[PDB]
Design goal:
Chains A, B: Keywords: ATP-binding, Cell membrane, Cytoplasm, Membrane, Metal-binding, Nucleotide-binding, Protein transport, Translocase, Translocation, Transport, Zinc. Chains A, B: Belongs to the SecA family. 2 copies of one chain form a homodimer. By secondary structure, chain A is of the alpha/beta class. The first copy, chain A, has 5 domains: about 1-225 and about 350-395 and about 790-800, P-loop containing nucleotide triphosphate hydrolases (Rossmann fold), CATH 3.40.50; about 225-350, SecA, preprotein cross-linking domain (Pre-protein croslinking domain of SecA), CATH 3.90.1440; about 395-570, Rossmann fold, CATH 3.40.50.300; about 570-620 and about 705-790, Helical scaffold and wing domains of SecA (Orthogonal Bundle), CATH 1.10.3060.10; about 620-705, Non-ribosomal Peptide Synthetase Peptidyl Carrier Protein, Chain A (Orthogonal Bundle). The first copy, chain A, contains 28 helices and 19 strands. In chain A, the strands form 5 sheets. In chain A, strands 12, 13, 14, 15, 16, 17 and 18 form a 7-stranded parallel sheet that branches. In chain A, strand 17 (about 505-510), helix 20 (about 515-525) and strand 18 (about 535-540) form a beta-alpha-beta unit. In chain A, helix 5 crosses helix 6, helix 11 crosses helix 14 and helix 24 (about 625-640) crosses helix 28. The first copy, chain A, is globular, with a radius of gyration of 33 Å.
Chain lengths: ~800, ~800
């Protein structure tokens, strides 16, 4: 860049300099390690770890650390990293995207920053697209890591949960984006801490950042699980409840509770052939379903809270009664209603846990990535992952010839030209590589070759292994390979025998894909390390690409000017029109994803509280403090309900409140009216709470001292998991359900936030309350064992784009 | 907060602790400065500056620095900052928003962090809403700053550009948001560096951050200037050009240039009674208008580049000829076209420079703010200005009584109740404060009092001075003040004589404004420092607030249930419905602004290059390097045009190119064909460029050695200003013009970016080219003096929200 406009490349210029300087300092001390014993070298790692355990930091040991690795690699592999490669690693160490054109040795370069970061033993995941690339890579680069004395673990979805913990224990872990992700998810559904495979997320080096952070990040990671046909239960509950309907079946107003601690119910409910008094392993399922049936009958009313329709039981916004979108009542209350209205009780598969690759890779303490095509989306990376794509120089100047797109009028008449180009180069002995975007493309162009008499090999994505070795031999003399959508990406083709004299590897594009990155990856599959090559792109006016840009007015001026006569056309202005459009597509996609995150950022805020909070229980010793805090919190909300905003100071329905505390937290007639006569609301809390401690000390004294510590963990876990899971599916219902009925001035996202959080607060209070009750009014039976709220099989999948 | 949900206030909890600790350390050493001589204390500043000039940093000297100020204030003002106030300052020093309820002494607190940051003498602006608050503040707090030995300057729009430089030279500068902003703008329109009032932006302490960063930031700062009826010029140009139309009037194709360096034109153009050969002070105006008229005739065609309509001359997107929105041809080319088509030649007022308060206050190296209501928009602050609102504790626990809104059916029947409340408290001797949102409110409620016989004072925003002193006496016995939209905000009312016994200051809300912050500011105007008070809000079903939420379905259930009988109503669920709606309004506003910035962020990127680049010329000594780089850059683009993408290697229209170089950069017949016969395109550059140096050394040798250094600065300045100004107005045309015709999948913002940048590149190349020419083919005349491209009067204003 020359002229005023050059100032743009200024921020990325000062950076590339530091890295160029550093690359020299690393090359300076190349003598200190050049002539040394393998053991003395390996012992360098220990010196580094020690210095780090003392003041030193990663940056301090950067030049030296890089030196060691640069050398170590020469010994293990016949390769000694170039200044550019050293520059790349630093970039990566900085937390940026290091864009380095294919054939620059990205893989090896990845070891410099991975090594330096793996010294504190905090861990370093090196994510990749498929299982194969990760295996291969960890096997070859592992040698350099291990040699210098580092543990390198591999992670696959085949590996038992045990085999995993192992790989995540390693100094450096290789894996795929999908695996890493699901593990995170499954790790938060764990019952006992030791079931978790992952360690705290440290540093992530994403190889092929675009494919991973951008492409495969268009949809979220979903873990679901259908219902075990639990329809027969809801009906029963609905039926029974209709029986006993006596005033001796409490349901105070201000509380909005349908308490059933009375004998008339406590006993008659057991007459439904239950395992009798056993109110623990049975107090969950049956009791949970019976309270909802009781609430759906005594609290909810056919035409004041919900609206029954030929579809389902739709809710109604209290203020200005508006029909709720894809909203539902939590904890199966929606079910109790459908049963009460006899309407179809919808039993579907729920979404247990979810997260976006965006919010996922953002958890790591530091992130970084490498790829060939990164500038195209440069604006997004910096946006979502606060990473600046640093365009790393090339070892040798490029000499590959990039020819201007050749336009064609007829689609089929286009491919007939492509087949020719391929054919004529084949005879010269030049290795050709035609890339396509669709299967029919590689298919129909393959038959053109079979009828023309030219040997070739199709590259449909069936098995990464096979393609890998087939691509390598794509630079030989009679080489003619038809690649579809970057078949074996990651493996660069090295020019065959003296193929350089015969020109070079000439790549042929049968059409340009939406994102430039894609046809740029194809384009760069030639000319690695100054090699000679030519890149040709064939475009016809019939390409779906054209028809989506609205190029009809240009199609006319083309035919209206007997232009379609001149078969090949190289219109500079039409090529720009094409790219200018790809940019539009890329922009929209960037929106879809930018939107996706925004919606998940609502869940993220929530997951943060639940996941962190859950973890505490799973990994705790004295759960009392946590529990008590949940009990006292549940209590206050109760005290606050019977003592509203100064509504007649000492003239509150005090008599009714004490009735509730005796039916919820403390036993019957344990709290006398006089106890709460002439005391502020705050006063009351400390007061009746101190009576909870009494019944608590007794609960822990009458029962086992430490078996109680388990009672707490079992209850709180089940409480949390019960709700959270129902909430997540509910949040997923809401997110897509809103898209239907909505016209208000406020955007849909605002609603999702406001309604979503409000739903969250309900679950928190419901958890706090459920948690408190069981602790105070439930007894231990046959055995106390944490149970999995998830029933049946679980599925780990990611939605296809749509 | 109690229970699981408490974990949310965790991030803001660890922060408030550091600040509580620090506040103690600052209180620890209160003895070191307690008993000391004024001089010894003042000498502390010097010790600090010295320590800073050596290793020490602001954080290091924080506890000590705060100590000094805390003490210094006690001496100057009878006040000694509380721990909370010390905590606030630290927050501010951190770069956060310190939210501290009215009456917490925000002003004084502002000195702790302002002082500490003003030690390196880099400057510190303390922005405020109006001129008065800034004066007052700088006068009272200045004393503490000056005392400790610091220069405190005030900035007003009345102050001459000279008086300004002074205020911005000060150690600490007080000012208003609007002033600061315009100064920045005007500072970049400066001809000679020394005309600039501002210094590099350092630290900004925004008092009333919400009002400034959020409220008054709903629109941009615009500086415009209409045209001096320069219509008679365009017509003439259009007319003349039609005359000479001989092939001896060059206009090559590939170049797309309408060069008029031939004698047939060079002379006949002068026959239009020009000041003759004078091609310098005249070579700008007349020549610029004549080339556009020549281009609008030889390059543009009635129905292939533009479309003439009863409106104007609309452009047409080349590929798939689409009618351009509010786009226009730059450099008055659009004019040459309207003249050529005789169509109305639109002469309007242009927008010279613009910026958003968002992008403005983001320039400062560090930013921070203080206010009472900040949590409401907490999500936005962190978003746009990366600031976390830290909710600072109160010196004393609050005891003000916040009563639930009282709902009314009839609007007028509501106010009749308000007047009563006001009246009954007046008799008791309690000072009342009724706030309104509209003038008619305070108006009509004022007559209710005049007819009832109660003394009061209206507070329409006429003069900040007056209201200030009227508000102070709003806490006395027979005090009854009617405030409208926070009249004298910034001035807290101190309870009158023993007024505390008579209850306290009871504030009355005649309606709740859209944003809660607003009715929260009103609400907090009572109870400062544990004072006793009551806050009452009156809402009626007729309030415009209700009618915009769609509360009709609730209006019915209210009347359909003979509810309107019970005049006052305190529905907990209806109050929530109200706030839940205010939140919606606030969300939308947050969008309008979030959108505003996004559009300006396109300009920001551009301003960055031009402004920075311009500044270089204004403040440079050896402009050659800059110029040459602009000439060589302009040259390359030319060489690249005649030598397209490998289109017949040595078979380029070489003969025509040399013709252009001789008509643009070098003189006639200076470059021979043989010179460019068998040389790569890169080869050519270095080649014909070396001949530019020759004619350059000669231009600088034949003419003055250093008067040339002025020739460069004059030309480049005029070149830059010519275009930039036209571009800015063009960008402003485009931004609002797009909103009309647009349906494509891509959002409007994407278009603005893509088209906007493309427009930018044109101006850069046009500048680079214009700059190069004049330097090589223009001569010095009567005098060489930088001229202001701006003609007539200039206006500095900000659009009202709409």
């Amino acid at each position: 860049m020359l002229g005023i406009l050059n100032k743009m490349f200024d921020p990325t210029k000062r950076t590339l300099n530091r890295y160029e300087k550093i690359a020299n300092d690393i090359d300076a001390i190349r003598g200190d390690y050049e002539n040394l014993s393998d053991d003395a070298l390996k012992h360098k790692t220990i010196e580094f770890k020690e210095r780090l355990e003392k003041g030193a930091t990663t940056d301090d040991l950067l030049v030296e650390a890089f030196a060691v690795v640069r050398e170590a690699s020469r010994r293990v592999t016949g390769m000694f990293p170039f200044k550019v490669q050293l520059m790349g690693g630093v970039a990566l160490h900085d937390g940026n995207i290091a864009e380095m054109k294919t054939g620059e040795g990205k893989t090896l370069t990845s070891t410099l920053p991975v090594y330096l970061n793996a010294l504190t033993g905090k861990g370093v995941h090196v994510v990749t697209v498929n299982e194969y690339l990760a295996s291969r890579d960890a096997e070859q680069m592992g040698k350099i890591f291990e040699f210098l004395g580092l543990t390198v673990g591999l992670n696959l979805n085949s590996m038992s949960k045990d085999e995993k913990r192992e790989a995540y224990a390693a100094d450096i872990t290789y894996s795929t984006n999908n695996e890493l992700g699901f593990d995170y998810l499954r790790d938060n559904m764990v019952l006992y801490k030791e079931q978790m495979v992952q360690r705290p997320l440290h540093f992530a080096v994403i190889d092929q950042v675009d494919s991973i952070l951008i492409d495969e990040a268009r949809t979220p990671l979903i873990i679901s699980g259908q219902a075990a046909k639990s329809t027969k239960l809801y009906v029963q509950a609905n039926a029974f409840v209709r029986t006993l309907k006596a005033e001796k079946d409490y349901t105070y107003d201000i509380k909005t509770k349908a308490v059933q601690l009375t004998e008339e119910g406590m006993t008659k409910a057991e007459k439904a052939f239950g395992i009798d008094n056993l109110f623990d392993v049975k107090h969950v399922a049956l009791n949970h379903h019976i309270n909802q049936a009781l609430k759906a009958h005594v609290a909810m009313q056919k035409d004041v809270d919900y609206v029954v329709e030929d579809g389902q039981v739709v809710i109604v916004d209290s203020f200005t009664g508006r029909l709720m979108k894809g909203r539902r009542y939590s904890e199966g209350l929606h079910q109790a209603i459908e049963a009460k209205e006899g309407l179809e009780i919808q039993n579907e598969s729920m979404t247990l846990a979810t997260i976006t690759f965006q919010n996922y890779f953002r958890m790591y303490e530091k992130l970084a990535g490498m790829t060939g095509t990164a500038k195209t989306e440069e604006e997004e990376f910096r946006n979502i992952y606060n990473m600046q794509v640093v365009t790393i120089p090339t070892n040798r100047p490029v000499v590959r010839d990039d020819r201007p797109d050749l336009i064609y009028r007829t689609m089929e008449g286009k491919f007939k030209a492509v087949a020719e180009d391929v054919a004529q180069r084949y005879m010269t002995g030049q290795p050709v590589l035609v890339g396509t975007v669709a299967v029919e493309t590689s298919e129909l162009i393959s038959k053109l070759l079979k009828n023309k008499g030219i040997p070739h090999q199709v590259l449909n994505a069936k098995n990464h292994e096979r393609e890998a070795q087939i691509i390598e031999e794509a630079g030989q003399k009679g080489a003619v390979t038809i690649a579809t959508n970057m078949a074996g990406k990651g493996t660069d083709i090295k020019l065959g025998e003296g193929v350089k004299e015969l020109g070079g590897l000439a790549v042929v594009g049968t059409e340009r894909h939406e994102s430039r990155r894609i046809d740029n990856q194809l384009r760069g599959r030639s000319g690695r390390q100054g090699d000679p090559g030519i890149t040709q792109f064939y475009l016809s006016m019939e390409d779906e690409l054209m028809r989506r840009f609205g190029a009809e007015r240009t199609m006319a001026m083309l035919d209206r000017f007997g232009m379609d006569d001149s078969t090949p056309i190289q219109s500079k202005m039409v090529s720009r029109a094409v790219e200018s459009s790809q940019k539009r597509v890329e922009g929209n996609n960037f929106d879809s994803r930018k939107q996706l995150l925004q919606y998940d950022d609502v869940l993220r805020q929530q997951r943060e509280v639940i996941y962190k909070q859950r973890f505490e229980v799973i990994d705790s010793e004295n759960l009392r403090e946590i529990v008590e805090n949940m009990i006292k919190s549940s209590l206050e909300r109760a005290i606050a309900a019977y003592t509203p905003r100064e509504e007649l100071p000492e003239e509150w329905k005090l008599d009714g409140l004490v009735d509730l505390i005796n039916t919820t937290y403390l036993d019957e007639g344990a709290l006398e009216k006089s106890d709460i006569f002439g005391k502020e609301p705050d006063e009351m809390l400390e007061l009746i709470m101190d009576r909870i401690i009494t019944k608590y000390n007794e609960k822990e004294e009458q029962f086992g001292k430490e078996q109680m510590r388990e009672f707490e963990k079992v209850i709180v876990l089940r409480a949390v998991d019960s709700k959270w899971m129902d909430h997540i599916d509910a949040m997923d219902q809401l997110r897509q359900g809103i898209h239907l009925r909505a016209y208000a001035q406020t955007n849909p996202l605002r609603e999702y936030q406001m309604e979503g959080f409000a739903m969250f607060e309900h679950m928190i209070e419901s958890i706090e309350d459920e948690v408190a009750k069981f602790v105070m009014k439930a007894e231990i039976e046959n055995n106390l064992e944490r149970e999995e709220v998830v029933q049946g099989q679980t599925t780990a999948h990611q939605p296809q784009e749509g």
